[PDB]
Amino acid sequence: DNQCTVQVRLELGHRAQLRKKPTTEGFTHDWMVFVRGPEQCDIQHFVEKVVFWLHDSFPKPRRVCKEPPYKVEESGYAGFIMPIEVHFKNKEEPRKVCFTYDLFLNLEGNPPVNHLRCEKLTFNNPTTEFRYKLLRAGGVMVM
Ligand SMILES: COc1ccc(CNC(=O)N2CCN(c3ccc(C(C)=O)cc3)CC2)cn1
């Protein structure tokens, strides 16, 4: 009857580089973390918001992006593990997915960091409304 699985893809990533000169605060690095879809996909169809949970050392460390670009750009002096929550426009479970993102910086001398983490999300028997949103985003029905 109505069994199906819908797969969508998310790309998490970050860039970091050593500043030519530290900030007055002693911030050595510029970095950027993001969540995006692959080319020609619009994840905003199924994503309500992305929450980036910065290290307690940052002011207002809960950074919300309710629309693209889903990204945080900062200057700092150390990497950390960053919880990233991708909230879905889904009425039922699952409502979100959480990733533990390793935001690492390039130690002196080393080239800039430019990392990508590809995540495939499998939704089993999504609702009609949420299935609509997944497929509008470029999601694929399996079997
Ligand atoms: C102990 O382990 C760790 C691990 C990782 C870090 C990284 N943290 C930073 O790089 N920074 C945190 C502090 N920074 C700010 C401080 C103050 C302001 C205000 C008041 O506007 C803005 C920014 C940004 C850079 C730190 N400690």
UniProtKB/Swiss-Prot annotation:
<feature type="site" description="Acylated histone binding">
    <location>
        <position position="102"/>
    </location>
</feature>
<comment type="function">
    <text>Acts as a key chromatin reader in acute myeloid leukemia by recognizing and binding to acetylated histones via its YEATS domain, thereby regulating oncogenic gene transcription.</text>
</comment>
<feature type="region of interest" description="Acylated histone binding">
    <location>
        <begin position="77"/>
        <end position="79"/>
    </location>
</feature>
<comment type="subunit">
    <text>Component of the super elongation complex (SEC), at least composed of EAF1, EAF2, CDK9, MLLT3/AF9, AFF (AFF1 or AFF4), the P-TEFb complex and ELL (ELL, ELL2 or ELL3). Interacts with ALKBH4. Component of a SWI/SNF-like EBAFb complex, at least composed of SMARCA4/BRG1/BAF190A, SMARCB1/BAF47/SNF5, ACTL6A/BAF53A, SMARCE1/BAF57, SMARCD1/BAF60A, SMARCD2/BAF60B, SMARCC1/BAF155, SMARCC2/BAF170, ARID1B/BAF250B, MLLT1/ENL and actin.</text>
</comment>
<protein>
    <recommendedName>
        <fullName>Protein ENL</fullName>
    </recommendedName>
</protein>
<feature type="region of interest" description="Acylated histone binding">
    <location>
        <begin position="55"/>
        <end position="57"/>
    </location>
</feature>
<feature type="domain" description="YEATS">
    <location>
        <begin position="1"/>
        <end position="137"/>
    </location>
</feature>
<comment type="function">
    <text>Chromatin reader component of the super elongation complex (SEC), a complex required to increase the catalytic rate of RNA polymerase II transcription by suppressing transient pausing by the polymerase at multiple sites along the DNA. Specifically recognizes and binds acetylated and crotonylated histones, with a preference for histones that are crotonylated. Has a slightly higher affinity for binding histone H3 crotonylated at 'Lys-27' (H3K27cr) than 'Lys-20' (H3K9cr20).</text>
</comment>
